[PDB]
Design a binder for this molecule. Structure first.
Ligand SMILES: CCCCCCCC/C=C/CCCCCCCC(=O)O[C@@H](COC(=O)CCCCCCCCCCCCCCC)COP(=O)([O-])OCC[N+](C)(C)C
Ligand SMILES: CCCCCCCC/C=C/CCCCCCCC(=O)O[C@@H](COC(=O)CCCCCCCCCCCCCCC)COP(=O)([O-])OCC[N+](C)(C)C
Ligand SMILES: CCCCCCCC/C=C\CCCCCCCC(=O)O[C@@H](COC(=O)CCCCCCCCCCCCCCC)COP(=O)([O-])OCC[N+](C)(C)C
Ligand SMILES: CCCCCCCC/C=C\CCCCCCCC(=O)O[C@@H](COC(=O)CCCCCCCCCCCCCCC)COP(=O)([O-])OCC[N+](C)(C)C
Ligand SMILES: CCCCCCCC/C=C\CCCCCCCC(=O)O[C@@H](COC(=O)CCCCCCCCCCCCCCC)COP(=O)([O-])OCC[N+](C)(C)C
Ligand SMILES: CCCCCCCC/C=C\CCCCCCCC(=O)O[C@@H](COC(=O)CCCCCCCCCCCCCCC)COP(=O)([O-])OCC[N+](C)(C)C
Ligand SMILES: CCCCCCCC/C=C\CCCCCCCC(=O)O[C@@H](COC(=O)CCCCCCCCCCCCCCC)COP(=O)([O-])OCC[N+](C)(C)C
Ligand SMILES: CCCCCCCC/C=C\CCCCCCCC(=O)O[C@@H](COC(=O)CCCCCCCCCCCCCCC)COP(=O)([O-])OCC[N+](C)(C)C
Ligand SMILES: CC(C)CCC[C@@H](C)[C@H]1CC[C@@H]2[C@H]3CC=C4C[C@H](OC(=O)CCC(=O)O)CC[C@]4(C)[C@@H]3CC[C@@]21C
Ligand SMILES: CC(C)CCC[C@@H](C)[C@H]1CC[C@@H]2[C@H]3CC=C4C[C@H](OC(=O)CCC(=O)O)CC[C@]4(C)[C@@H]3CC[C@@]21C
Ligand SMILES: CC(C)CCC[C@@H](C)[C@H]1CC[C@@H]2[C@H]3CC=C4C[C@H](OC(=O)CCC(=O)O)CC[C@]4(C)[C@@H]3CC[C@@]21C
Ligand SMILES: CC(C)CCC[C@@H](C)[C@H]1CC[C@@H]2[C@H]3CC=C4C[C@H](OC(=O)CCC(=O)O)CC[C@]4(C)[C@@H]3CC[C@@]21C
Ligand SMILES: CC(C)CCC[C@@H](C)[C@H]1CC[C@@H]2[C@H]3CC=C4C[C@H](OC(=O)CCC(=O)O)CC[C@]4(C)[C@@H]3CC[C@@]21C
Ligand SMILES: O=c1c(-c2ccc(O)cc2)coc2cc(O)cc(O)c12
Ligand SMILES: [Ca+2]
Ligand SMILES: [Zn+2]
Lengths: 612, 612
């Protein structure tokens, strides 16, 4: 916005000041004879500051003018130690520019005059940001690795580059290559930089050194969805046991992958990333066999056991609403439109028989069970929802909004029972619907979990809610029309639209065709009704048929074209929740440990397969 | 389960005890220097057993080490006569391991030291099981044939390996090649092992030796759907008569294919197996014209006659239920909600007029026709498939269950008629519905109805069982809400939810939109009715749209491309059933008997075809 306008004016007044200054211009235009005349005129203003604090060496390096960049050196050798001074390109020297532009003959002549290989481009354009378009690090050795130039990397380290150097984000030169868009070229540069880590006394192998978020180069490849570097780093963690003809028993490490409770694991960090490429890591041969192992053995059976206890809680709540205390009414019927026969009992007369004491036991099971919902989930939606992730699990999305809304409605029914307020049917009727609609979500884990089952259910609900916005204006147009047509008529003969909230609810029902069209045949209806309702019935039929076709066309686009899994991240983030809630004695750790088989303290997973 | 927990701990215990013992380690690492050290120290415990009861010679053959394996054999040659004595790898010798690993120079080393080529590896990890990735037999000829090694098969026969050795479930080496995943490589090995059957004095040749289930290799390729080896084994059963340009008159054997009437044939095995590529053999040439021969000539006439006799029998049963004996009621009505006017007559009253004697003939035809159902179908589910194929063949046809359940309901109605019990309308109502829905069975015998009935009848138990559970959750949740909203109201105006079972039935009907939404308009309905029913109608719309989208994917797309294949497989199961039940005087045996043409007592089918 205001900042994007600021970058654009900054680049235009850069080119404006390179044209209105001759030594900046000849460095750009590679006018080698124009340098000799101006520099012999008593070295005029060789300490230039252009738009981005640039000197004339920065211009000559930027446009790959090797012949013009030489003349600046013998004229004043103090320009090779000069950075750019603006906020956007802060700290960038000429050695950074020639490395990114891959100018071989220039970068030797810079090192020939002792250019610092440990400079730090701290500017706002050299920071990881979606507004920035490249993130190449902060060091010249980091710039050489990202543009894929093997010969510069061998040249820079020879002059003393530090491969252990880190950024302001803590990323070393091996963290940055995982962030690069071309994966295959970054895979060759990874093997190169590890070969120069001879260094057996640095107390840490360099591909274990964490950034300021604690992530290793292994975990960062799992978070950023870099599947090419993930499979490359996994051969460091395999161990082939035997090969019996076509069979092979491979043993995987599972130290930085499986959860230990005290530390965030790779399975959790894929979920909170919310990226589309990070879910491809869940398809990989150590991780894919781990998720299906614990969602077959502990994760799924405990999911169905918690849903069976919730079903007994809602049945116990349902019985207390059916047998709610009611007495015949005390006052007389006011209007002839008053249908009410019964009313609620007061608190003193609610409990005076032994059959009410059986109900009182059931009413206390409900309230105690409603507090437990608040005591375990008011932490959860703070932890889960706004901090890490929301709506990408099974039992997920509008489950946690609704079951919190359930337990709120039960405690409202308790208050209205105590102060003997009228209208407890209103918090109960919400709580029956809210409570039983949550049972449909536990029914989602009774499935074999295909790749396009839960996301299609989530999709169809998403299109129906978009259809309800477009049909609200169609109802409001025709309900207002139907209201003023029958506004001069007698509602004893046709009372579908007798006041305006009823006319709105009738037109909603006629749209879905769940009540019949109004007709009497013993009296003359207005003529404007018949042509309006014939227009309404054609519109409502076509809009309901186009809804079905639009759900078919949107189903095809997300199965055949969007090509996103969604089905492994749902069973991961469900299994993470049940593992933090249950104690350790009910949850054995997946894999098998060492010290009785002699491999360490590490929890290995054996995978046996057939090559064919 | 705990089976993989016990299996994975032994593979780590194996690698542990290799790492513990110096003799097992240096043989594993092919460190033959320590092999000479540990033998000249002492003739030690060189008959020690690790995890899976193995020796140092088993390890050296497992990890493909020529040099380490030799040193064990000159030191102590008695290790070659040693099987693994655990339960997982019981019976396996080092000769088995070298063959599977295809270490050809090690095979010469063992056979020069007279390694027994008839050892039977009868372990747990060698049986045919869905938990095993391999089923290679129990013999070294069987192990060599399944890894596609010609030079080892030639080497083992020359050293006296029995080519007709059998597993402990019956299979010879010719059976095992059909059970292999690579069909093309098995065909070359099949031709090779018959080229060593020169020594025929054995009454059954190798391609005519049954296993413990009676199946030959030709029938086993039929059951397993091995269409590659089926066509190759059909070349042995052909007989080409003449070639007249592009024409060819091939004569087929039909001994193991056609129903012999004593043994289960090839047609009977393919129908009674739960496989899909086995059904593809119904399009192979000698079977395809055999099936069309039986149906066009004797199957379709006997099926249309049986469909016409059943149709008249149900019309006779229908008129006996319409004219069932009823008299006016004796007592007076109790409540004004009592709607009953008539009740049943008794046996003394039900047969007094000549119209009752006409009905008595029709009732006896009904009872006799239900006993004949229980005599041709009940001694078919007790001898053949005692309780198993009574449930196993239901995927082929559910109409066995419906016609037996019909035949009981007629006899339940008979017993109640004799003891004058009340409530004959309950067993009749099941019998009328089950009587007329069994007419839909005979729709398969028509080309106009057959393929279209396949698409209509095809319902999916993965999504409709999901729909029935979620429908029941909405109905129990919203009928409970609708019950307590109208619990205080007058039910003579709106009586849809007057007690709780009717509210369950009204909400069921409103979900399917088969009764109108409740409305009076002459009285004030409660406010929570409009909120709940609008929420209910959007949920009921969504669950229908979830059901249509579920019916448009990956199963109905499969049936829409396979309905001609699925209909021609119902023709086979109908024809095979009719050929068993009808006597041999009404069903002539197919093909042409070659007794009067000099061909043996075999029944030949003649097929003329154009190669062009
Ligand atoms: C009847 C009308 C009144 C209701 C109006 C308000 C209702 C909402 C309407 C809002 C406006 C209409 C727009 C459609 C909905 C959002 C768009 C969307 O993405 O759809 C998503 C629906 O949502 C889900 O099923 C997943 C859960 C995430 C969202 C949380 C819902 C809020 C809970 C409160 C809910 C109400 C309970 C409040 C009362 C207690 C799914 O779309 P998708 O992308 O195809 O799915 C792929 C999943 N993926 C994204 C992970 C890849
Ligand atoms: C999430 C997807 C769905 C979208 C949600 C919204 C869906 C729609 C939900 C609607 C909820 C209810 C809204 C109106 C309720 C007022 C009724 C009332 O009190 O009537 C009173 C009158 O006063 C009126 O009639 C005022 C209504 C006129 C304007 C309608 C409001 C526009 C909705 C804003 C949003 C629309 C935009 C949404 C689309 C962009 C009483 O009238 P009476 O008793 O008949 O007597 C009159 C006296 N007389 C006899 C002299 C005549
Ligand atoms: C696993 C799920 C699969 C599905 C299987 C489901 C399982 C089986 C499901 C249901 C069981 C069988 C049906 C129940 C019928 C009750 C008996 C009856 O007919 O009513 C009789 C009495 O009954 C009452 O009055 C009940 C009063 C409220 C009881 C609340 C539950 C108490 C449970 C305690 C804790 C539970 C622990 C739960 C938490 C762990 C007759 O009553 P009335 O004379 O007609 O009316 C007057 C009553 N009034 C005076 C109060 C108004
Ligand atoms: C004691 C507490 C329980 C503890 C149990 C401990 C062990 C539990 C362990 C495992 C439990 C589950 C194992 C069953 C086998 C899996 C098959 C399956 O999932 O069906 C199908 C899903 O369809 C469904 O949605 C559900 C089908 C079953 C009906 C309802 C189940 C019970 C509901 C409540 C009744 C009362 C039960 C609760 C009582 C209150 C499979 O679908 P699909 O074929 O993959 O379709 C893919 C098609 N596509 C590829 C095109 C997309
Ligand atoms: C191919 C498909 C199309 C062709 C289908 C056939 C053609 C169309 C089908 C039917 C024709 C149309 C209706 C029938 C005649 C009209 C009604 C009538 O006159 O009946 C009269 C009574 O008569 C009776 O009581 C009927 C007895 C019922 C059982 C019939 C036994 C048949 C015996 C043969 C066994 C067959 C062996 C089966 C072999 C497997 C009516 O008299 P009423 O005034 O109503 O008084 C009733 C008093 N009562 C209640 C005391 C009785
Ligand atoms: C009393 C006399 C009645 C008739 C006799 C009894 C009927 C028998 C009729 C036919 C025999 C069997 C039919 C299925 C064919 C073989 C499958 C099988 O055997 O297993 C089935 C057992 O079946 C059941 O458990 C009950 C069926 C429930 C149907 C629910 C919807 C229909 C409702 C309509 C009526 C509404 C009721 C409302 C009325 C109040 C289910 O197993 P599966 O799902 O195939 O296995 C899962 C693996 N899969 C996912 C890969 C597929
Ligand atoms: C109803 C009266 C009762 C009388 C009882 C007395 C017993 C005897 C009664 C009939 C004897 C039938 C056997 C002989 C004829 C069959 C063989 C045949 O020729 O094939 C014919 C088809 O078949 C037919 O069109 C005839 C069907 C007869 C009625 C059967 C009703 C089925 C009832 C079940 C309801 C099912 C629906 C269920 C849906 C829910 C046609 O053959 P084609 O292909 O044209 O041949 C090529 C000829 N061409 C070369 C010249 C072209
Ligand atoms: C698919 C489900 C299919 C069948 C399942 C249910 C079969 C029928 C149940 C009705 C029982 C009955 O006869 O009611 C009796 C008692 O009234 C009650 O007991 C009310 C509670 C019903 C039982 C528990 C339901 C909870 C969910 C089910 C738990 C298992 C399901 C779990 C999840 C699948 C009769 O009382 P009434 O007639 O209401 O008296 C009204 C008096 N009045 C007229 C003055 C107002
Ligand atoms: C004034 C009226 C419109 C009441 C307003 C409340 C409704 C807008 C919301 C509240 C929560 C309900 C929901 C309750 C649970 C269901 C199941 C559904 O998830 C499933 O399990 C079905 C599969 C699928 O989503 O397609 C998602 C939302 C739905 C239909 C409901 C959508 C609409 C409801 C009635
Ligand atoms: C599903 C598509 C076709 C429409 C989606 C719009 C709904 C989200 C809204 C707008 C129309 C409905 C409304 C229509 C009018 C009624 C009036 C109602 O108040 C009364 O019933 C008073 C009746 C009287 O005074 O006689 C409150 C909300 C309600 C049920 C509805 C609430 C929600 C609905 C379902
Ligand atoms: C006196 C008794 C009858 C009280 C009711 C039983 C409660 C002790 C339990 C069983 C039903 C509830 C559960 C209902 C559902 C949730 C979700 C949870 O599953 C997940 O964490 C995954 C959610 C997701 O992946 O989106 C399992 C337990 C929890 C919080 C609840 C924990 C405790 C509750 C209140
Ligand atoms: C006294 C007389 C006039 C009554 C006539 C009796 C027939 C109406 C019934 C009695 C027993 C027979 C039935 C008995 C069993 C068979 C197999 C068939 O069983 C199946 O459903 C096959 C299922 C499958 O293959 O998938 C159903 C009807 C049929 C041909 C028969 C149809 C008609 C028959 C001759
Ligand atoms: C359990 C899941 C896997 C499938 C369940 C679906 C159906 C088998 C159920 C759903 C709700 C229905 C029931 C809902 C309530 C009714 C009441 C009915 O009659 C009464 O009890 C009294 C009615 C009256 O008062 O007149 C008996 C069964 C019925 C139709 C239904 C029987 C079967 C239905 C279709
Ligand atoms: O059920 C249908 C049908 C339908 C289904 C089967 C038929 O035989 C006819 C119409 C058409 O459009 C819809 C459109 C919808 O929005 C919702 C629906 O449930 C349907
Ligand atoms: Ca109607
Ligand atoms: Zn497409």
């Amino acid at each position: 916005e205001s900042w994007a306008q600021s970058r654009d004016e900054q680049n235009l007044l850069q080119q404006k000041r390179i044209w209105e200054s001759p030594l900046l211009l000849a460095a750009k235009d590679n006018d080698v004879q124009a340098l000799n005349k101006l520099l012999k005129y008593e070295d005029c203003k060789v300490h230039q500051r252009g738009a981005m604090g640039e000197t004339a060496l920065h211009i000559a390096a930027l446009y790959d003018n090797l012949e013009a960049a030489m003349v600046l050196m013998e004229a004043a050798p103090e320009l090779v130690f000069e950075p750019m001074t603006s906020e956007l390109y802060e700290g960038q020297t000429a050695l950074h520019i020639a490395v990114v532009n891959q100018n071989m003959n220039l970068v030797r002549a810079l090192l020939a005059r002792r250019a610092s290989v440990s400079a730090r481009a701290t500017g706002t354009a050299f920071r990881r940001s979606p507004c920035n378009l490249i993130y190449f690090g902060e060091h010249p050795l980091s710039f050489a690795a990202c543009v894929n130039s093997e010969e510069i990397v061998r040249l820079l380290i020879e002059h003393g580059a530090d491969i252990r150097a880190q950024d302001s984000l803590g990323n070393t030169v091996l963290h940055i290559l995982i962030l690069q868009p071309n994966k295959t070229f970054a895979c060759q540069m990874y093997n190169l930089l590890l070969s120069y880590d001879r260094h057996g006394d640095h107390l840490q192998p360099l591909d274990l050194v964490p950034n300021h978020q604690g992530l290793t180069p292994f975990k960062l490849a799992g978070v950023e969805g870099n599947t090419v570097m993930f499979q490359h780093l996994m051969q460091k963690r395999k161990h082939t046991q035997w090969t019996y003809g076509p069979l092979t028993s491979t043993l995987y490490d599972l130290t930085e992958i499986d959860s230990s409770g005290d530390e965030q694991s790779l399975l959790e960090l894929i979920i909170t990333t919310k990226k589309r490429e990070a879910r491809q890591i869940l398809d990989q041969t150590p991780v894919k066999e781990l998720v299906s192992l614990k969602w077959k053995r502990y994760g799924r059976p405990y999911f169905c056991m918690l849903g069976a206890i919730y079903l007994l809680y809602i049945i116990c709540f349902t019985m207390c609403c059916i047998y709610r205390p009611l007495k015949p009414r005390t006052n007389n019927r006011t209007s002839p439109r008053d249908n009410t026969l019964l009313q609620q009992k007061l608190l003193q007369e609610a409990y005076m028989t032994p059959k009410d004491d059986i109900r009182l036991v059931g009413e206390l099971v409900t309230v105690i069970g409603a507090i437990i919902i608040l005591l375990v989930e008011v932490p959860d939606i703070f932890r889960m929802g706004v901090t890490r992730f929301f709506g990408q699990t099974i039992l997920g999305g509008p489950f946690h909004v609704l079951i919190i809304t359930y337990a709120f409605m039960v405690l409202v029914t308790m208050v209205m029972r105590l102060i003997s307020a009228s209208g407890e049917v209103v918090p109960m009727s919400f709580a029956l619907v809210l409570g039983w609609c949550n049972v449909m979500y536990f029914a989602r884990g009774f499935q074999m979990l295909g790749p396009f089952t839960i996301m299609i259910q989530k999709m169809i609900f998403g299109d129906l809610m978009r259809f309800c916005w477009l049909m609200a204006v169609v109802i409001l147009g025709f309900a207002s029309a139907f209201y003023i047509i029958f506004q001069t008529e007698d509602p004893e003969e046709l009372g579908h639209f007798y006041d305006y909230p009823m006319a709105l609810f009738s037109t909603f029902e006629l749209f879905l065709t769940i009540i019949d069209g109004p007709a009497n045949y013993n009296v003359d209806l207005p003529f404007m009704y018949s042509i309006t309702y014939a227009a309404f019935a054609i519109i409502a039929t076509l809009l309901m048929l186009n809804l079905l076709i639009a759900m078919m066309g949107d189903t095809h686009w997300r199965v055949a074209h969007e090509r996103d899994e969604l089905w492994r991240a749902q069973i991961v983030a469900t299994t993470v929740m049940l593992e933090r809630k249950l104690p350790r004695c009910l949850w054995p750790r997946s894999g098998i440990c060492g010290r009785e088989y002699g491999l360490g303290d590490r929890w290995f997973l054996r995978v046996e397969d057939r090559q064919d």
